[PDB]
Amino acid sequence: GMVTINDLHYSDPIDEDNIINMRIPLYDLEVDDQFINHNVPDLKAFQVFPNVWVVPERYTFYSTMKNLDAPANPSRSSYYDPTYLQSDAEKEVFLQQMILLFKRINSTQEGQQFLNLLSRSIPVPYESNGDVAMGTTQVIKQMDDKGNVLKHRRAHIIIYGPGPDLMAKGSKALTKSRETGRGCMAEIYFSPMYHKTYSTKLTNKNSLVDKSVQEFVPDPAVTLIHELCHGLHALYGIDLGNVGSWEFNKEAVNFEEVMTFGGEDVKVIKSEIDKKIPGILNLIKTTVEPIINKITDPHDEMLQCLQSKYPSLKGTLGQFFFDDTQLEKDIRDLWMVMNETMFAENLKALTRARYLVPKVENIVQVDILSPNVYTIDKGFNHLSKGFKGQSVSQSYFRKIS
Ligand SMILES: [Zn+2]
């Protein structure tokens, strides 16, 4: 409906356009006097729509994520398999699964708007003596076959496979700009095939769920959206990870998880959010207004992208200033509209009522490319009421242990 999901396949050759050889963003990460990721291979990467890249490789780029074998005390909801995503055939499956998920998200107007937002929400650039331009942390390196850089490419969201634990999913904001008002790209680590399941008792009381459903599997497009929403916050420089936390039901859940998950729990932390909001908005004003007002060319594309990312940003060349009420409204709208709960409703899939869970029922494997399992329009519920296509009992969900 607005972005187009490119039809790419793993075996398609590098074309230096949508299919590139990518050097990882954290290639030069120094942790504790070690260059953690030196000599990691350059990776085949697929731009599935502007500035969103899929890389069918295991995420092994923090030092906690280097060993694919199980640790000493593995969680009961973890699963380890060093061979997952090692062959080219598996990378194609992964790429095709990711493409199907994006098409699902793109199946409604709200998901179209979301993907557009990811596509266009540039991190704010740096001033360079008159010249506003992208900094080195705001681009990925496109490489030849020999370790030389051919050029620098924009990236907003990079999706990789899981780390050691096939079941774990998440968003890694590249830099501290995630919370400074400037923003940064996010690396997501995600398996479309390996999922945790939840009791329907964890679903809210209003839920339309069939009574034969004891235990359900989340729609992988909705789970992907959860992580893309962290992504989006990182692009807007409004990550709430260090802004505060709340103790539920107890255990501590940071504001970033709460606002991302959506639903009722948002009301509990609202008073705390409202104290902090002025500061966040001010970091936004303070970061973007000086930058944009350096641009002396009215046809500058940065100008346009900034005004498009922040419609609250008004004025004329050299003299752009936020509308303070509007910017507050628009940021709050990001959280209120773009969150997991709202996207579950929007794609009509069952999710749970609360981010924190007491336990996982099962861990399962499912291939959404297989015949009769998953459609763009309905995910697991093609021709099902009460979300029955998401019950663990379906032939397409295999329990692991
Ligand atoms: Zn999260």
Numbering used by the authors: 0 to 248, 262 to 413
Sentences from the paper on this structure:
Botulinum neurotoxins (BoNTs) are produced by the anaerobic spore-forming bacteria Clostridium botulinum and cause neuromuscular paralysis (i.e., botulism) by proteolytic cleavage of SNARE (soluble N-ethylmaleimide-sensitive factor attachment protein receptor) proteins. All BoNTs are expressed as a single polypeptide chain that must be cleaved post-translationally to form the active di-chain molecule which is comprised of a 100 kDa heavy chain (HC) and 50 kDa light chain (LC). They all share a similar three-dimensional structure; the heavy chain folds into two distinct domains (the cell binding domain [HC] and the translocation domain [HN]), and the LC is a Zn2+-dependent metalloprotease. However, a BoNT-like gene (homologue of BoNT) was recently identified in the non-clostridial species, Enterococcus faecium, which is the leading cause of hospital-acquired multi-drug resistant infections. Interestingly, BoNT/En possesses the unique ability to cleave at least one member of all three SNARE-protein families (SNAP-25, VAMP, and STX); however, the cleavage of STX1 was only observed in vitro.
The structure of LC/En was determined at 2.0 Å with one molecule in the asymmetric unit by molecular replacement using the predicted structure from the AlphaFold2 server as a search model. Clear electron density was observed throughout the structure except for residues 127–130 and 249–260 which could not be modelled. The overall fold of LC/En is similar to all BoNT serotypes and homologues identified to date, consisting of a mixture of α-helices (31%) and β-strands (19%). The Zn2+ ion is coordinated by the HExxH motif residues, His225, Glu226 (via a bridged phosphate ion that has likely replaced the catalytic water molecule as observed in BoNT/A structure), His229, and an additional residue, Glu269 (inset). The analysis indicates that LC/En appears to have a much larger cleft volume than its closest related homologue, LC/X, and is most similar to LC/A. The presence of a glycine residue within the putative S1 subsite is particularly interesting as it would contribute to enhanced flexibility and reduced steric hindrance close to the catalytic zinc ion, such that it is less restricted by which substrate it can accommodate. Additionally, the lysine residues at positions 168 and 195 in place of hydrophobic residues (Phe163 and Phe194 in LC/A) within the S1′ subsite may further contribute to substrate promiscuity, given their increased length, rotamer angles, and potential ability to form both polar and non-polar contacts within the active site depending on the substrate. Loops 1 and 4 are significantly longer in LC/En compared to LC/A, LC/F, and LC/X. The additional portion of loop 1 contains several charged residues whereas loop 4 is predominantly hydrophilic, and the increased length of both loops may contribute to the substrate promiscuity observed for LC/En.
